[PDB]
Subunit: 377 residues, 3 copies
């Protein structure tokens, strides 16, 4: 593939991708427990533990019901003084002490209630999607690290992934899973996770071609070539990416979609330019620009191009039909009737809670009558 001789034919070099073939996934089963084991002094904590269980039931019961509906489709003077003293003792012993003791277990109960609530939130974060959609979920990073015991070296080694594969796999969301079974009373869900096996085709590189209009002897012409062509070593072939997943780094296809390329097209791509079926534009709309990673290419030889906020027209020095516009002059270009903006940077911000100041507890002072008793003795 020779680009220098295609540029003058109106074909602009586009993005480059590697080429991978997707095979059957590896499977790993994980059981997620929603109700923690809390034991000891059950009579003290009981009330908060039961409300928690109802939260879990309300979340899991709809999963069980859906799985049953789909059962066939799921894959798997001294006397008076003493009387006063005893009366006071009575009120302390019958009212004050019993209340304080009850408050001590209300406190433990609430502490457990908070701890349980946070545990649910941790699960909601990691296995949220699993609970929300029993079929075909996207697996989170927290769920993955749990699966491999927080060891990504082991993850890569077992799957045979490079750092580049982990990145594009997470980008596309190719790690998926399903709930196969649940136990509502126990608070258990059985989640099955599928980890894809990707294979790299050696030296196979996919090259995008972006044709735009150009002028020649007269009139306006467009050259017609496949948008995507596959090059390996010295071989060229046609591909169809409409059924493939495309990431920034590679094209991931199930099966191998390469097909034989015609002689005439091979000729053009390699620099012949003898044929390159160019077609005359008479009563059709055709493109006059192409965009690649922020670069703007345009046929400013045919149409009127302008740089905004400099109020300056754009022209060509000839020797080419396609010019690259310089992004260092302005943010907005006009090509024909279309205004093209660029990806400028906006200032940094933050999200946070307001600062919180706590006040002191109410503290009861000690009762000290030593100075009075001393004067009675």
């Amino acid at each position: 593939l020779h680009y220098d001789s295609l540029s003058k034919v109106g074909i602009i070099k586009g993005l480059t991708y590697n080429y991978k073939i997707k095979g059957s996934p590896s499977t790993k089963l994980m059981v997620v427990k929603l109700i923690p084991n809390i034991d000891g002094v059950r009579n003290c904590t009981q009330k908060q533990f039961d409300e928690y269980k109802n939260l879990v039931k309300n979340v899991l019961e709809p999963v069980k019901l859906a799985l049953n509906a789909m059962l066939d489709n799921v894959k798997s003077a001294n006397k008076q003084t003493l009387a006063v003293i005893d009366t006071i003792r009575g009120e302390i012993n019958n009212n004050i002490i019993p209340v304080i003791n009850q408050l001590s277990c209300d406190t433990i109960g609430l502490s457990v209630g908070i701890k349980l609530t946070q545990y649910y939130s941790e699960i909601l974060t990691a296995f949220g999607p699993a609970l929300q959609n029993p079929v075909n979920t996207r697996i989170t990073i927290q769920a993955i690290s749990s699966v491999f015991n927080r060891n990504f070296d082991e993850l890569l080694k077992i799957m045979g992934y490079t750092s580049g594969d982990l990145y594009e796999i997470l980008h596309s969301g190719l790690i998926r899973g399903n709930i196969i079974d649940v136990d509502v009373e126990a608070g258990y869900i059985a989640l099955e996770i599928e980890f894809p096996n990707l294979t790299l085709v050696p030296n196979a590189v996919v090259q995008e071609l972006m044709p735009i209009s150009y002028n020649v002897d007269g009139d306006e012409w467009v050259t017609l070539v496949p948008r995507f062509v596959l090059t390996r070593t010295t071989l060229l072939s046609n591909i169809d990416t409409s059924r493939c997943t495309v990431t920034e780094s590679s094209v991931i296809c199930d099966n191998d979609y390469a097909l034989p390329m015609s002689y005439e097209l091979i000729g053009c791509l390699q620099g012949d330019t003898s044929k390159c079926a160019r077609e005359k534009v008479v009563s059709s709309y055709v493109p006059r620009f192409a965009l690649s990673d922020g670069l703007v290419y345009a046929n400013c030889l045919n149409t009127i191009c302008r740089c905004m906020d400099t109020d300056t027209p754009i022209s060509q020095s000839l020797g080419t039909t396609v010019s690259l516009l310089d992004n260092k002059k302005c943010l907005v270009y006009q090509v024909g009737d279309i205004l093209i903006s660029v990806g400028s940077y906006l200032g940094e911000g933050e999200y946070s809670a307001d600062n919180v100041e706590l006040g002191p507890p109410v503290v009861i002072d000690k009762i000290d009558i030593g100075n009075q008793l001393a004067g009675i003795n």
Copy 2:
């Protein structure tokens, strides 16, 4: 494009979309803090604050680990009486008071614990996806309003969006972001958000064409035209939408996919009908109906059509090969062997909590012995 003369050829007018070209996104960085600054009487709150920190660590550590694995891919008698009194004072001063004072800080601790838990839930709602999937997330509306300080007029002004663009952008989910870095101990994540720059092509309208079978001199025929044709002013061109995002209002493509249209096709679309490559149907299955926004069009001149629950056959008055069925007669139509239902309305419902009634607190009465002391004095 002249529809009246295409109807008699078996081509039914379909949906209409505008046409837009997607360029490089604008970038804005936001730092999200998961641990709030709570200060004052640290000895009182400490215990609940530490459990919260462990929740945050369990959520963020897997993000840090994944980012490191992907480091190369991430973009960025009086004496006895006194003895009794002092004994009672002792039990109050050594047992009752110390317990009450401890309960006062247990209460403050629990209050902080609840407040912290709710803060996490707010973050889980707005930045949930960011934490779950470090690469290529969909940005929530809460995260967006945070970015623009709850001012959507500013949002639209900076990006150059109309209300129609904000709607279709949220519909498709074109606002994306990534975590670039984290600090597990600090509880910080650095989230980068990409806001797309869409440009409108003036007067460019995409029109869907839906061919069905029809009869003529004899036998059964189907006319073959591209499903999508692009019309601007007086110009027609071919497009390929298999690589574009399609919303209810518009087709959003990266780069411009328009290509020159052949003379013969232009002729047909504009009403010539001289060629319109019609092909004979001999041993193939072909469509006899078309659906558009609930409208059902059918070739009831060729096949048998019926209106269900009226038990009434459907017929044509001729003068056309395509008839539109009236949705005011029945909900289910039969065309040939296929039963076609319509989008009926189901009754309104609600989701809510059961009403909760609270009981009163236990209240300790005051100790009043004034009437007894008065009789001793």
Copy 3:
């Protein structure tokens, strides 16, 4: 369609799918209330209820703002002794009792605060997506069971779904919804849910064809056929699935994409093999294998095939151009320069909380001076 005679031409039978046409969805409106009705002793609970309301406001206000921005686009000695006794009574009555009574309502307040927090978490689980993305969300299973009162028999009956439809609908995520209106002060959102109406085309089966290279008289050849062909009874037609949703069980298309098939292709598919436009491979890359549900087919007659970890070469007995490799011998195959792995099983694991042990409450002993009073009397 006759496969035995296509195998020798290099065409391998692929996956089989049913064929369905998607029509207008049924609509059901549900109102979700985020603030529960808690009443009684309002002076005791008030403080925690107000903090909860602020959580709800922070989540809903951005939804209201977005809806307003999009308003035009949204679809809808004895005396001294008595003095000591009264002094002690004073400290109990003025310090100890008031504090204990306050702790009793602090306890009720905290209990309500926990209960409210959990309710929000339940909503975040079921209607999370609705709050996060006001436009075009995926509906969760919890939201669906709420809509049908936890009765999936009613769900299937009303929609006319079979268990197979519920499964593939949840798999693809075809149940969608939008927030049409909100009330921030009331804590209400109005969520509209669209349930798709799918219709099955009788006997319509889509068959995938996977061509690979083969040898014949000499040189290397590839036969070119459409990847997907539609067969009904005795009729064959061409389809285009690039615009359709594909599930494991079926192809779900809006409208009907079948078009007439050419005579020559019908001939080949039915076993003629007279034409089958076979093309010579001269300077192109072509596939030498095909993958289907873990099965690996390969042209080991043309290239070199090996079984890894057995260190054994793979050969053919002839009588065929395509051989199926046996997955019971090894996990990794080499075909040409490409290493193909298989979906092996990884061991079962679990996610859970550490077991928690609770200690006892602090219990205040009763004050017993009966033995001393008895010696004074």
